[PDB]
RNA sequence: AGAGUUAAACAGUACGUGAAACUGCUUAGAGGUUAAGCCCGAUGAACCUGAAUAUCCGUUAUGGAAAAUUCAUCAUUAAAAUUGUAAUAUUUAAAUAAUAUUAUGAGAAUAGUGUGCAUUUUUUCCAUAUAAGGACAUUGUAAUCUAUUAGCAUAUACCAAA
RNA sequence: AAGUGCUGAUAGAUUUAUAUGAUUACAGUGCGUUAAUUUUUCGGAAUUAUAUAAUGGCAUAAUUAUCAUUGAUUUUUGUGUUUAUUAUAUGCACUUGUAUGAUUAACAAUGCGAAAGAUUCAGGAUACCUUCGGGACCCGUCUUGAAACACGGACCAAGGAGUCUAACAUAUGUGCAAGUUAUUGGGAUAUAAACCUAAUAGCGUAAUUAACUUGACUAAUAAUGGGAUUAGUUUUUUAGCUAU
RNA sequence: AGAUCAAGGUUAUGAUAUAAAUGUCCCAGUGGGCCACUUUUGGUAAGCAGAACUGGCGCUGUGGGAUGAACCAAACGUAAU
RNA sequence: ACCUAUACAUUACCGCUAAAGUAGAUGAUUUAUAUUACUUGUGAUAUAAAUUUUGAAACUUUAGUGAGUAGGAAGGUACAAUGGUAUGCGUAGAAGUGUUUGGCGUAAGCCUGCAUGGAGCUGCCAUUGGUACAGAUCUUGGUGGAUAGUAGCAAAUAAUCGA
């Protein structure tokens, strides 16, 4: 299924030692099978290129379950693409019968972080969580970061 | 009767002789068609004196007169009649050889049709056969 | 891999292609979210692009000779190059030979 | 006799597009002619950038189309981008601008047109600005991408910060000996 | 070995093709040195491949025939396109553009008729005149350029050496 | 050092310059003031002023700068002076003329592509045989070094060795782009294909801690914010260049 | 030690530029070397042993030294002169 | 004096490397001539004839330049299959095989005539593979020299006559 003329064997055939050397022939396994031995005769290769192999840092959690750390993330950077931008122009006349209502857990997200630099309208954000800067940089604009259940 | 083409040049040649592949005199297994030797202690690869000569691009013939036949023409394999209608106005650089596959039945027409368009066929008198 | 088989549309076949691959204006209904691919070059006629009078009011240099003309002569046996190259040296020829 | 010309007298570059695209291999045919007969350096850097891969023609979001344009003083300078203009949702209100591009994502064609300005292929650029008067020829970062984050790595120097080829992010994955001063050493 | 059979026995039971290795026979030339082979330059023998027509100091001067013509100074007539205008409908409110229909105009275009329509026209073959009826190739020749090699030598200027 | 005045030979000569761009600028020949001078008388022949800055020569002024300085060498020149020297003041035609487009072409001889039929001249180490000269050790391999008194190979035909996979990484191609990816399934259904498609799911979009915590620029705005070195587009006025 | 102004002549040895600068693939091979000038240690010496410099051989044909891996000339597209 | 290299030099040719040029052809350009604006003079217009595509992946111009194992990269080339194509070839002779048939290529290779043969085969564009042999004391079959008739067919007493 792979175009063989561009493979080297179509081309190296036939000069004699097939690209692998007269002195230092292509033998079976001249260094070790696999990660042998990254602690004796491959150690330079294993630190560089992978510092941190060969130890134990520690706290064992027998049977981690991947729900107790779920918490999907969203910054204030989006937050307003979740309502339409075509529903951003109308509150940008200016006219504030709004903040809107954003229910970030109905979308998929829990943690509202604060990267952001979001506009001067208020928002009403029902998410399950907070950043310190998500609470500030919303309530400065008027609205409120609110707890989803 | 066909005039040779396009006011002919003088076709001159670095080697006429063809290159004949080391040790092919010695063995019946080795064909005389050239291989480059790859092997280390070889005096032909190493280009010793009075051994023989390898190919290279330096013997390459003139770019005007490259693939030109003895007649100043260049070949064009014709396989049926309406390939000759390609040579209606290339009859002044090219020439046709009727293929080996083309039979004695049709060749009589290809020869007669190519006599009208004045092309110089390089093998008439093929499948003549002044017979059935 | 070779585009363009000779094809025959019936009538109600032909009238559905504005739904399958939708249109240039709107997407398609029968292929959810599909949007017809845009070419890298919309006008794609080079001989009218190069024709053109919007471009030939910019163009500079149609270098119309070839300027090969090459052979180095010898200004020590070919006298006619001496008087081309060092024109004063024609005088010294007609002075001492006189 | 002479010693020398060694190498590389063979200079190093690419001289036709490797895309066999019949639309790209026609804009090249055009822009050969717009830089050998109008010797602009604007038009070299379109023939040179019609050649490169898709690394070396990196995407450039709709906000940098706009974030650069609003560096002002040219309110009718079309934005020339030899590549893709994608869409930034983090920009909300988009200014009316005129865009030249090889590919435009439709969520960005739906927005620029709505504003509404233009979207130009590169043959409508040259039929409008052949010499490139009043244009803004931009390119997104060539080392934006994350393949480039791993080049090149001695742990032992105080400046590497260059991202191993792990399979997975966690403890008990290259986080112990040679990274921490307790286990082994700090790199 | 004759004969016979088949399209064929060069398909006769190694039964399609029938390669190489190796070889009996015929024909050819040759033989005391690198053992033989072989490279390169030539060679004898043998076979072979390729070869040319409109000019000097011109595709010029000039007379003969034939046929014939939308050609003329030709003229009408019939088209079908082309090109360039105009108009409608398709168009992304408009224009542009692009298509398709409609219409104008020019010159061209065939086909048919047509001063004389073969009057000196018109397409095709023949006459003589300057170099020669070549035009090419293989050669001796000639002068020219490039690189070079040998040769004779008109004349200044220089230092002491009288 | 000057061409001084040549005489001999050698080898070589790209070019389909429109098989998508000067054969023209040069000079050289042949028609249209003058007048005496000279020479041969058949040509030629010579002659001035005709306009130079004049460059060289002379005289002189002048100054820059110097080997050594009595001087010499200059330098910027300038004037006068005459002795010379050189260039410019040849259009219109017309040549088979010379040059220049990698400067080879004019003259002859030899010979007829010749209707089928068929010679002449050149060439053919094609793949051999004959005759000489020159060169010329047996390949593959390992090796510092092989013709090796190193290993394999008597010869011939068939077979005969860098692959599938898995997972990464880079480069290039292609599709879409903060996304993307039917393919486990389902549906339509023409048949192990193609098409269509719901809920996810991977990977990306946010990270860092051993962990619990925590979670990305003063701000409704900002590409390492800021700084350098910046290709490029806009821009400044200036003489200025082609057209105006 | 810096951030912005003001002044600055003719850019501050010579000769060079077969293009240089920079990433990635740290991709292939290699990680047995031998020879030589001058320097040099061990050995009595060695065509032995071990180092420093430059150049070679390895990988390299051709001319010369009758002969030769390294010597002396010279580095190699096919040909004429 | 003179002889002598694959060095030096000038030329032809091949490649490489580096530059440079060409694409309004309902256009450009000649040669004449009719008219002409006329600027004396040179242009513009009409006529008659003429030249003027290139897989622009092309064509044209110019200069330098060429060692190579291990090794890497490009471009070709042989083999066989698949998807399209060549209104392909074929008992009027396919493949194969032979061959002092004739050429082409720098080469790998390829075309062609004749000979034999007796039913299938190819060029091109894709994409692919059980994809190229001189070696491996390689595998399997065949054959040479030796020697095609050499070593040898000699222990166990022995046969001979005539039919």
UniProtKB/Swiss-Prot annotation, chain A:
Ribosomal protein found in the keyword field: yes
Domain of life: Eukaryota
Keyword set, alphabetical order: Ribonucleoprotein, Ribosomal protein
Region feature (Disordered): 1-37
Statement: the UniProt record of this protein carries the keyword Zinc: no
Cellular component GO terms held in the UniProt record: cytosolic large ribosomal subunit; cytosolic ribosome
Bias-annotated ranges (Basic residues): 1-31
One GO molecular-function entry: structural constituent of ribosome
A GO BP annotation: cytoplasmic translation
InterPro entries from the UniProt entry: Ribosomal_uL15, Ribosomal_uL15/eL18, Ribosomal_uL15/eL18_sf, Ribosomal_uL15_CS
Family listed: Belongs to the universal ribosomal protein uL15 family.
Name by which UniProt lists this protein: Large ribosomal subunit protein uL15
Species in which this protein is naturally found: Drosophila melanogaster (Fruit fly)
From Swiss-Prot, chain B:
GO biological process: cytoplasmic translation
Entry GO MF terms: structural constituent of ribosome
Keyword Cell wall biogenesis/degradation part of the UniProt annotation: no
Lineage top rank: taxon: Eukaryota
GO cellular component: cytoplasm; cytosolic large ribosomal subunit; cytosolic ribosome; nucleolus
Keywords: Ribonucleoprotein, Ribosomal protein
Record-stated family: Belongs to the eukaryotic ribosomal protein eL32 family.
Protein name, as recorded: Large ribosomal subunit protein eL32
Lineage of the species this protein comes from: Eukaryota, Metazoa, Ecdysozoa, Arthropoda, Hexapoda
Gene: RpL32
UniProtKB/Swiss-Prot annotation, chain C:
Alphabetic keyword roster: Ribonucleoprotein, Ribosomal protein
Disulphide-bonded residues: none
Key word Isomerase present: no
Biological source species: Drosophila melanogaster (Fruit fly)
A GO molecular-function descriptor: RNA binding
Ribonucleoprotein is among the record's keywords: yes
GO cellular component: cytosolic large ribosomal subunit; cytosolic ribosome
Organismal lineage: Eukaryota, Metazoa, Ecdysozoa, Arthropoda, Hexapoda
Organism domain of life: Eukaryota
Single Gene Ontology BP annotation: cytoplasmic translation
Name by which UniProt lists this protein: Large ribosomal subunit protein uL4
Family per similarity comment: Belongs to the universal ribosomal protein uL4 family.
Name of the coding gene: RpL4
From Swiss-Prot, chain D:
A single cellular component GO annotation: cytosolic large ribosomal subunit
Pfam families attached to this UniProt entry: Ribosomal_L18
Keyword Ribosomal protein (UniProt): yes
Main location: cytoplasm
Keywords tagged on the record: Cytoplasm, Ribonucleoprotein, Ribosomal protein
Biological process per Gene Ontology, one example term: cytoplasmic translation
Location(s), subcellular: Cytoplasm
Source organism superkingdom: Eukaryota
MF terms (GO), sorted A to Z: RNA binding; structural constituent of ribosome
Stated family: Belongs to the eukaryotic ribosomal protein eL18 family.
Name assigned to this protein: Large ribosomal subunit protein eL18
Species assigned in the record: Drosophila melanogaster
Gene responsible for this protein: RpL18
